[PDB]
Each structure stands twice: as structure tokens, then as C-alpha cells.
Design a protein around this ligand. Sequence first.
Ligand SMILES: CN(CCO)S(=O)(=O)c1ccc(N)cc1
Length: 460
Amino acid sequence: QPEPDMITIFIGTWNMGNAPPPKKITSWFLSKGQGKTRDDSADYIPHDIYVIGTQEDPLSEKEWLEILKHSLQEITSVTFKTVAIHTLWNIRIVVLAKPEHENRISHICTDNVKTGIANTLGNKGAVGVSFMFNGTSLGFVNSHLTSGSEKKLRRNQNYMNILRFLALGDKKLSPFNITHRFTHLFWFGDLNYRVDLPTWEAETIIQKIKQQQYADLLSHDQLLTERREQKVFLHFEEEEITFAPTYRFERLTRDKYAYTKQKATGMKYNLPSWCDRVLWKSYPLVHVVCQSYGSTSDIMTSDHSPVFATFEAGVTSQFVSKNGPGTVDSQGQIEFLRCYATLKTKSQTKFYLEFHSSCLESFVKSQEGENEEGSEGELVVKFGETLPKLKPIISDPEYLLDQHILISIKSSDSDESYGEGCIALRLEATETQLPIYTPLTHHGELTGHFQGEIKLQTSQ
Ligand SMILES: CN(CCO)S(=O)(=O)c1ccc(N)cc1
């Protein structure tokens, strides 16, 4: 029974509007409706992993699990195993996997973050799940961010609090937030970003949706514009949106957008918007292909339509050699030449690097770099040829070229990370000096760059 080198992952997000679902929701799991939809010829082919994010979910965990499992069983004739379920208030995440994956899945973690203070603490935040699938780390975040067209900045703040404080993945990766802990990170939910057009244009927007002409609406989508200006979701991907706005519908039809201000909305307009989104971030040069991104047309219990996305994701096997794990493989080494960090910091402390990777027995601390002044004001931390020689646990190129090195640049004075990034070992050549590069972030904001050259020795 060979170990897979690819799996498919289903991501669903649905704001249920506090209403029970209808008797049939199979169209969601089948990626049928509007947008980038899944071919009919695939309908009986189960995805390997289904990750379901709900918001405003009125069901017990038990009630929702029964509906999900019975749905998937009707589609696939497979009884899925529950990997994890975690609920914060009415925000929920369920992970289901094919039974053949039960002994490939380990290190299951769940967590939640509550966003806001006093007034704004009590219903918004995020839930998450992480686990290992053989040699590949997978993270999943379902967030319900702040509502309202005039609160995009609050949403961006909610995003930063979630990525700082959601405690998933390998706790030994202490300098790294969730945006660096996983081979593949999926972040989805009711992100609540709106189409920022004047209220007086509501009927014009509706007209445009009826014509399936989304271009002039997407150009005002706050998530796209905030992402363009690097205000949120830096270094994440999203598939092109080719489905109608998923909010705000009249219930029991999809024929009408309910946008006008009402006591029930706090006298706020809800212009048709793409509130319900799926984004991802994978390590550099790992296979990840979005194969569907759309909304259902036939599930109408909520004022939101369900959104689906599916992905092909590269995975690796749990590698064992005669040597590692449990020792080094002297035939393997990673060297760094001519490396330097460029930091935006106004501070003058010494800096050192930490190299973290599952290809190492434990993380490696460098010597302090040499600070110089850049031409345009910047701090440049020079490591020259001073960086240590990293000793991987396994030298087989079929293993080592699939690995990644996480880098943190830390203050000597405070031992606090000023920036985090990631370098792929999927090189064009071994035993050859080759350029490397990663942006550096801290709390998911750009703080600098790390660049230099790498020389990788494998057993071949
Ligand atoms: C129309 N629907 C069935 C009855 O509602 S469906 O769930 O949207 C659907 C199912 C399978 C395919 N191939 C296409 C659409």
C-alpha cells in the first residue's frame, strides 16, 4: 500500500445565520454551483481530507457531525473518521478524513482566539486545527471577523491577533507564528470584507451581479484592496473569484439580495459582498493547486451561501534511513555563503539567526552578524561566510530536497524575533552555490529580507 505524494483537501466555509441547514447539503461537498466548479466525472471520488468551517452555527457538535458524515457517506459510500472538532461560541471547525489515513495523521492540535476587548469581545474570533499527514504539516483556520463595511481596519487587527495567538503546530518552533509553522496553511471563514461602493449604488451592484459582471465589484472588494496594499494576509494566495457575492441574501431563495438598513442590522447597509473566503499559504516550491472555488446555489437557509474550495497538495512520506532519525548522516550538509539580513528596524542591537527544520535534530543558533548601514537608511546584518554548517538527519536527496529551513533573526539583547522566513531546499543543483531569498515578517508584517547563497550536499 504505497504512501501518497499528493492528496486533495476540501475546504468549506458557511455562515449558517443561526438557522438549521436544509435536509440536503451535498452540492457543497461536490463543489457544484457558481464559480470554479468540480467536474461531474469526479463526484464519487472522495477528497482525502474535508475541513468544514461554520459561523453562526446553531447546531451541537454531535448534530453537525451526524449531518456531515451522512452527507459524505451518501456522496462517496465512505464512512469518514473524525480527526478533530473545535467550537468557540458559534464558530466551528470539523476535520474529517478517509479511514485509510487514520494512521498517517498524528500530532492533532486545536485552539481558538477571541478577538476584541469588552464591547468587542464575545462573539468574533477563530478556531483552528493542525496535524501531521505523514511528513507534511497541515494547518486550518476558520475565522469570523468583525462585521460592517466601515470596519476593514478592525478586521485586519482581528487577523493579526489570530495569527499571533492561535497556538497550533510544533511548539518547538517558538519564534514562528502559524504563518510559518505548516507546509500548507488554509485560512477561511466569514472574513466579512465588503464591496466598498456608495450605498446609493446598491441597485447598480445587483444589476451587475445578475449580468455575472464581477470586475467592477471585485476592484472595490476590501480584502483584495487591503491585500494589494499589504495591510492583511501578506504572502497568502486566493483563487480568482468567479461566483456572485455570497452575502446578504433573503432566506429561502437566492433571487434577492437584502441590503437595506434595518433595526436588525443596527441601521447598517449590507451591500452584496464576498464575505466568505478561502486563502492559503504553502512553503516555497511545494505543489498546491486550487481545483475549485465557488458557492452553492441550492442551500438557502442562511443569508450567506456556502463557499467551497478544493486543492491538490503535495505531501511527503515519514522518511526512515539506516542513520536518521536518531542520528546525523555525515553525507549531508547545508552551507550558507555571502548571507545578509536587511531589516526595517530603527534599533541598534546585535542580531543572530536561528535555523529550524524537521531535517535537523534541533534548531541551530548562529554567531552574531555584523551590522552595517544601507545606502537608503536600512540596517544590514552581514553573516558573510560565518553561518554554521547544518547537519541533516538524512542525506538521501529524495528526502532532503523536499525539506525547508525556517529562519528567525533574533536580538542578542532581548532574544526576541525581529523577522521570520522560510527557504526551500528544492534546489536546481546540489554541490553548487545558488541564490536564496525569503522575505522576513514579524506578526505577519514585513520587517526585512534575508538573502545569500546556499550549497547543499546530499548522498548523490
Ligand atoms: C442539482 N443538484 C442535485 C439535486 O439538487 S446538485 O447537488 O447541485 C448536483 C449534483 C451532482 C452534479 N453532477 C451536479 C449538480
